[PDB]
Enzyme design. Sequence first.
Site, PDB file in Angstrom:
ATOM      1  N   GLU A   1       0.813  -1.214   0.000  1.00 52.08           N
ATOM      2  CA  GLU A   1       0.000   0.000   0.000  1.00 52.08           C
ATOM      3  C   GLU A   1       0.844   1.261   0.000  1.00 52.08           C
ATOM      4  OE1 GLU A   1      -3.130  -0.446   2.931  1.00 52.08           O
ATOM      5  OE2 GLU A   1      -3.836  -2.278   1.939  1.00 52.08           O
TER       6      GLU A   1
ATOM      7  N   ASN B   1       2.531  -4.900  -3.231  1.00 55.13           N
ATOM      8  CA  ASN B   1       1.114  -5.248  -3.158  1.00 55.13           C
ATOM      9  C   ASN B   1       0.313  -3.993  -2.992  1.00 55.13           C
ATOM     10  OD1 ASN B   1      -0.887  -7.461  -2.871  1.00 55.13           O
ATOM     11  ND2 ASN B   1      -1.080  -6.778  -0.762  1.00 55.13           N
TER      12      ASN B   1
ATOM     13  N   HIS C   1     -10.100  -6.172  -3.912  1.00 55.77           N
ATOM     14  CA  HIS C   1     -11.253  -6.013  -3.052  1.00 55.77           C
ATOM     15  C   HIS C   1     -12.332  -5.289  -3.857  1.00 55.77           C
ATOM     16  CE1 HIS C   1      -9.233  -7.433   0.509  1.00 55.77           C
ATOM     17  NE2 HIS C   1      -8.232  -6.586   0.335  1.00 55.77           N
TER      18      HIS C   1
ATOM     19  N   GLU D   1      -5.831 -10.737  -2.415  1.00 57.54           N
ATOM     20  CA  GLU D   1      -6.750 -10.564  -1.304  1.00 57.54           C
ATOM     21  C   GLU D   1      -8.197 -10.472  -1.798  1.00 57.54           C
ATOM     22  OE1 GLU D   1      -5.670  -7.325   1.305  1.00 57.54           O
ATOM     23  OE2 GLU D   1      -3.486  -7.731   1.069  1.00 57.54           O
TER      24      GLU D   1
ATOM     25  N   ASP E   1     -11.951 -10.526  -2.591  1.00 56.94           N
ATOM     26  CA  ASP E   1     -13.297 -10.696  -2.038  1.00 56.94           C
ATOM     27  C   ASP E   1     -14.186  -9.764  -2.862  1.00 56.94           C
ATOM     28  OD1 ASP E   1     -12.691  -8.191  -0.676  1.00 56.94           O
ATOM     29  OD2 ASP E   1     -12.233  -9.269   1.168  1.00 56.94           O
TER      30      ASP E   1
END
Length: 302
Positions: free
Chosen positions: A131, A172, A209, A237, A239
């Site tokens: 990030e 990432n 995400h 990650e 979802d």
Amino acid sequence: QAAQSVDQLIKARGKVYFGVATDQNRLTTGKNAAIIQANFGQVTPENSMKWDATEPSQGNFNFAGADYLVNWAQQNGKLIRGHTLVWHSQLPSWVSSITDKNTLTNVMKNHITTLMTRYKGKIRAWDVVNEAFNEDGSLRQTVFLNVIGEDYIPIAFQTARAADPNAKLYINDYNLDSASYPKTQAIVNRVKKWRAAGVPIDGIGSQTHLSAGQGASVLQALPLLASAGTPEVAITELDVAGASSTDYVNVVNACLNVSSCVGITVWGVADPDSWRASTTPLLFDGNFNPKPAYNAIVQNLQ
């Protein structure tokens, strides 16, 4: 457990893994362990390898949770992604109060080296920097940027490469889901520039995400990420709010279409345990039964 394993099916299509985030607290309750055993091939620690968990006081490391996960994964034949070394969140206050460049540089290097050497040879990939970008594509003004400068990213990757030359080193980030987003363009450009200067960045991780309906965008964004020339990309990650099969199948197909996409990690097992549980965004429901999106992925992969 679902009868059919999405990990085995994705491996049959030429990919490395389909995995999940987990940790000791999950593995020791409910049906999580059995699901991961049967259906997944890789684990990412949800929290046990972050800075707050592992070095809560300078030089006083705590590996209990991380060791549990690594040993469990090894015993059960699961690949591990280490997560995450350099990040502004879940960072203890002793770190963020430092204003001296030499002091912080040495603290950061020691944190990287200590964690990576403990698990040397056991960890397939590490998220070295997490990030690091703002939404406009500039670098996020974290303690590392403010005190060390832009060199913190090269230093982190160089240090990680020295600590475990077998691990794939990733940067990432999230909101890399549309090819036209400022952040997506910026990470590609900066990774190209860093690699041209000799910085050892092996992978771009795209957290993924998503909101409902956004899966289609990944079909175009992931090839753009792959154009940066790293050996790997990964969906790290995943979802999806609402857990629509359409969105989940689109993300899988994006990875299938990009040769350097090694695999997919979903950010948990069962909906109630998600960081955004109210959006029921995962592949297993609150009763630990597979959802229609799980079965849609299976059918797509067969």
